[PDB]
Nucleic acid binder design. Structure first.
Lengths: 168, 293, 157, 55, 206
RNA sequence: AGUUCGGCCAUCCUACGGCGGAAACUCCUUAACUCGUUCCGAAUUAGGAAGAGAAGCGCCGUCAGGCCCCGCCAGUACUGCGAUCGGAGACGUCGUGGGAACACGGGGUGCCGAACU
RNA sequence: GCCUGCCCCUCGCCCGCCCCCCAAACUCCGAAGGGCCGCGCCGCCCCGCCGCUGGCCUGGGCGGGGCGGGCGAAUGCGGGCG
RNA sequence: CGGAACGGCGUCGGCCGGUCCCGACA
RNA sequence: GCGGCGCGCCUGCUACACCGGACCGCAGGCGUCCCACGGCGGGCUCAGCGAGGACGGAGACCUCCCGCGGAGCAGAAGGGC
């Protein structure tokens, strides 16, 4: 009645996403917000194509993302569950056992509201990985992971329930 | 909301299976092509690729020549052979690569030399006598009459990161005598200004381990127990690493001849294929499971 | 034809087959070539350099020069009423070795071997020339019970 | 005046009258187009010893 | 007036279909190819009667629309919409061309003559082979008496000679009157709907 | 048996479910260093060796998709060259030659080298 | 069936399943029929030459000497060269 | 009796079928 | 016939499975553009099927997953990757 110890679940990484069109310097202003929280330099993703509704024009930086892992991942995500009152919508868990939530106010995460830094909403998405997934990413011997070892959303909701005592 | 399936019989019919090695991902076909394109004029004259594969517990060096079917592994030396040569632990560090290289090179020069049984090969090409970091290109000097056996380098699919283990295995073959085309910029200590004999003289001597071992004991002895457990039981203290490397290199160069070690061929159960007449029966029983119910 | 490029009218010819798209098998580059070897030529789009003109496809020739990175096939092309010995330079990938006189190379040695066995025992020599089929013999055949065949009616269609 | 354009009719008979003439042995193995190095090896080797066209 | 149909009669040119190279195909008049009880049970329509093609020929779309309208009406008037299934099997695909010779002729004026004769597409037309079925009328027992008449009243509208045939096959279903029935007692006929197929022995069990 | 370098590139694939490891391999294991990351030791490098068959991988399934073979299709469609053969034509025969394909069954599911344990 | 009650129906789309007929600038497959080359010189043993090759005593070429043999599909016909 | 779509209880044949010596309501 | 330019050049047809095959025949282009849109070495996987995530929906981003090329390679089309 014991699972193999490699069958545990680990938070491989957390992505942090903003989408401030491009405005005049807004993407740079979100860079400051991401830098303090993750202690990392957020990389500016770029707009693809030029569309009418938003102001992206095939070259405006439209979003900033940093991927945080390990101890930083636990604390940044734990913040995100407290501010989301330990409640998450049930459908957030996805097919590959990846789930996300929305974070109003870069300030609500304990950052001080600033006249200089205007409120910027961000969103999160946490990727759950079963030890042994290296077979999918190694430069040599790159082969797809087997069915059992892939995290099914039901199994991951159980790891989220066990990890943060959340409710849906 | 209910969608199309990617694996249609159409997709499968058009699937072009890659080469068995390409699908497995062990061999990059493009590099193999350029390393093995002998110019046609020469013909039969063979071409040697010095494979230096890397593995979790072993570093494998073998000099190979690709014939139309076989790859003709000529002479081979692996990391697991090094404890016999006196290095009990650290069988996959940078220093152990520069030993794996001497192990292969000196075996190749002697194996060709004993067949030659004349004034040729190792006496003509002792190579650098000791392990030192100075730039040494074997064929760059006299290279009189019999030329140094030159084999081109096969990094495999591993990435050429500055001073990776595979670069230091090449130096080991070069120390042995085999000319392997090289520039040493990749080797650590090659600032564009110059090549540091020191950066090599210390890494070749396994002093990378020495700094960590001594520091680990001071900051956290308990971690140093778990991290370097084999080193402690073996009794190779950080100070002793330099002596171990010099002795092993000396033994490797003088007596390369390998000795056969026995292998037990264990057979796994390998439950064999169900017989075809029985194979139809399994469906026949299932048919009853649906009909009678 | 109002256009005549070096690749004119090559939609289906220079295309690779159904599931052989991809790099050449490494064997093509490795195979040995000796001056005087018949080399059948099979043009491919696998590489876009060294491709001979469409006419040169299928023209078995011998290798005049084994140059570095290339081969030199001399083929016989029909122009007017004269066969011209055109010498072309192909990259090895676009060329293949030819069986051509496969039967002959085996034939001379095998026939000679039959004589070599003959020099000892086997004093009569089996006629060492191919015979163009030749016309049957007695083959008396047993009728036994033979199925009667009757032509059928225009019914089932 | 509108005239004929191009038609190979009769061209085959003209060509095969006595045609299909082999290209000739002198061009069957000519040294045009051969490796420059091969040519220098063949000439220097032939000169020494038995084919001493030299004096 | 679309001209007489003898002008484009016979498969004179290689099939030229509506395509990215074709432009402005006029419009097949016939837009409806199945008339009657298209929704049908394979069991409820025992016999099928077809119109076989006497000669390789080109059949105009206006004919295919014309014939469709007339043949369908006779079964509809007597047997009823419920008792007939009408399938125009030949689709108008090839688009013939028509040469335009209009206005004055001359040098640097409106081009005239057979110079530039490629015709602007017109008359979507059908390609037929000897023995290709043109029409397929499926009926219950009730319409067996009126089925042949509906096909022939409209036979004249279809160009050239044609034949009327009773299918030894049971209905549209490929199986014959006997085979269909053999697989009706043995429970071996999956009913797809308008048509049916043998259950088969292939596929994962579950 | 297992690894490495390979040859031919699906009887070698793709999907699922079992079964397995002694060694070998993988997963693993951390970041003083060499290095490495549009950000991220994910990858990659360097330095390890407490676990582990859960994956990878090797073996069996499964009226499994494909892939491969043989039937069948069928002397069928087509077609080489002959007929002052038959047709208003469309076209079709007949003489002597060839001869598909898709469906549809019945099966098959890698093998060969070189080195080392 | 109802302040909105969507407590959900009928047609669609979309996805599975069959079905009817097409392509000259469509092709999983792919004939007939065409093209292109060979059908006598081999097997052995040595030995030279090379400014070329290669790690070598490795190659290939090009020669020369001995030895073991030999006319090795059918049919027509003397071919070539200015 | 250049030549068709259609027609011909014109004349010789053939194919697939039902009746009728319980002789084609007695 | 100067209304067009098949008057030099190219792609796919027509073209009748080696090749060569006509036409004010069809479906189209060319007369340029780019020191990066070039060479090389390294890394990488693309359009997208889904299933998820502040604002955020046909649609903008960020994730995995399955991804034989269904992407883009300066422009015609066809090969090719």
């Amino acid at each position: 009645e014991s699972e193999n110890p490699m069958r545990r679940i680990r938070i491989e990484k957390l992505v942090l996403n903003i989408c401030i069109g491009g405005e005049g310097d807004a993407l740079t202003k979100a860079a400051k917000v991401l830098q303090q929280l993750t202690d990392q330099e957020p990389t500016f993703s770029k707009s693809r194509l030029t569309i009418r509704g938003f102001g992206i024009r095939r070259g405006q930086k439209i979003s900033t993302h940093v991927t945080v892992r390990g101890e930083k991942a636990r604390e940044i995500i734990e913040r995100g569950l407290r501010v989301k009152n330990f409640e998450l919508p049930y459908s957030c868990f996805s097919t590959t056992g990846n789930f996300g939530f929305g974070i109003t106010e870069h300030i609500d995460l304990g950052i001080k509201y600033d006249p200089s830094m205007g409120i910027y909403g961000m969103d999160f998405y946490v990727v759950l990985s079963r030890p042994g997934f290296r077979v999918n990413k190694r430069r040599a011997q790159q082969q797809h992971v087997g069915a059992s070892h892939k995290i099914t959303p039901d199994e991951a909701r159980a790891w989220v329930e066990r990890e943060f005592e959340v409710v849906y | 909301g209910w969608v199309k399936v990617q694996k249609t019989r159409s997709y499968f019919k058009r699937f072009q299976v890659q080469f068995r090695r390409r699908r497995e991902g062990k061999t990059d076909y493009q590099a193999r092509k350029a390393l093995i394109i002998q110019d046609k004029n020469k013909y039969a004259t063979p071409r040697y690729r010095f494979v230096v594969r890397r593995t979790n517990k072993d570093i494998i060096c073998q000099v190979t020549a690709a014939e139309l079917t076989k790859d003709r592994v000529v002479c081979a030396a692996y990391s697991h052979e090094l404890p016999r040569y006196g290095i009990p632990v650290g069988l996959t560090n940078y220093a152990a690569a520069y030993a794996t290289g001497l192990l292969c090179g000196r075996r190749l020069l002697e194996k060709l030399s004993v067949g030659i049984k004349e004034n040729a090969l190792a006496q003509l090409y002792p190579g650098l006598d000791k392990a030192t970091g100075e730039e040494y290109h074997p064929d760059e000097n006299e290279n009189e009459e019999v030329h140094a056996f030159k084999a081109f380098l096969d990094i495999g699919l591993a990435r050429a990161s500055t001073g990776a283990r595979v670069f230091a295995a090449m130096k080991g073959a070069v120390d042995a005598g085999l000319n392997i085309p090289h520039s040493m910029k990749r080797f650590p200590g090659y600032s564009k200004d110059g090549f540091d004999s020191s950066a090599l003289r210390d890494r070749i001597m396994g002093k990378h381990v020495g700094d960590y071992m001594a520091e680990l004991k001071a900051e956290d002895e308990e971690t140093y127990r778990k991290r370097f457990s084999k080193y402690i039981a073996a009794k190779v203290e950080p100070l002793r690493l330099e002596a171990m490397y010099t002795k092993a290199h000396a033994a490797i160069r003088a007596n390369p001849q390998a000795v056969k070690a026995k292998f037990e061929i264990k057979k796994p159960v390998r439950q064999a294929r169900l017989t075809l007449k029985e194979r139809k029966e399994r469906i026949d029983a299932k048919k009853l499971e649906a009909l009678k119910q | 034809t109002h256009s005549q490029g070096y690749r004119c009218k090559t939609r289906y010819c220079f295309a690779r087959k159904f599931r052989r798209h991809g790099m050449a098998n490494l064997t093509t580059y490795n195979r040995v070539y000796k001056l005087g070897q018949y080399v059948n030529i099979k043009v491919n789009g696998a590489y876009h350099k060294g491709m001979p003109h469409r006419y040169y496809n299928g023209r078995t020739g011998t290798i005049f020069n084994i140059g570095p990175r290339a081969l030199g096939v001399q083929i016989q092309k029909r122009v007017r009423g004269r066969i011209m010995l055109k010498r072309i330079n192909v990259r090895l990938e676009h060329v293949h070795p030819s069986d051509c006189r496969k039967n002959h190379l085996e034939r001379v040695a095998a026939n000679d071997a039959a004589r070599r066995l003959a020099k000892e025992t086997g004093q009569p020599v089996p006629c060492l020339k191919r015979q163009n089929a030749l016309p049957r013999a007695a083959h008396v055949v047993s009728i036994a019970s033979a199925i009667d065949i009757t032509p059928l009616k225009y019914d089932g269609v | 005046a509108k005239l004929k354009n191009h038609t190979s009719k009769n061209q085959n008979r003209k060509d095969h009258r006595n045609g299909i003439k082999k290209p000739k042995k002198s061009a069957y193995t000519s040294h045009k187009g051969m490796c420059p190095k091969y040519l220098r090896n063949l000439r220097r080797s032939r000169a020494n010893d038995p084919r001493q066209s030299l004096r | 007036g679309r001209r007489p149909a003898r002008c484009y009669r016979y498969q004179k040119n290689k099939p030229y279909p509506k395509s990215r190279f074709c432009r402005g195909v006029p419009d097949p008049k016939i837009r409806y190819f199945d008339l009657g009880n298209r929704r049908a049970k394979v069991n409820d329509f025992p016999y099928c009667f077809h119109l076989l093609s006497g000669e390789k020929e080109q059949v105009s779309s206006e004919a295919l629309e014309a014939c469709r309208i007339a043949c369908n009406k006779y079964i509809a008037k007597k047997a009823g919409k419920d008792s007939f299934h009408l399938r125009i099997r030949v689709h108008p695909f090839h688009v013939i061309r028509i040469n335009k010779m209009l206005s004055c002729a001359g040098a640097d004026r409106l081009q005239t003559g057979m110079r530039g004769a490629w015709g602007k597409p017109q008359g979507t037309v059908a390609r037929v082979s000897i023995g290709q079925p043109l029409l397929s009328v499926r009926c219950r027992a009730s319409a067996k008496d009126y089925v042949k008449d509906a096909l022939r009243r409209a036979k004249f509208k279809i160009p050239g000679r044609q034949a009327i045939v009773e299918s030894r096959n049971w209905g549209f279903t490929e199986f014959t009157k006997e085979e269909y029935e053999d697989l009706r007692e043995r429970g071996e006929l999956q009913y797809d709907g308008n048509n049916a197929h043998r259950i088969s022995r292939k596929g994962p069990l579950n």
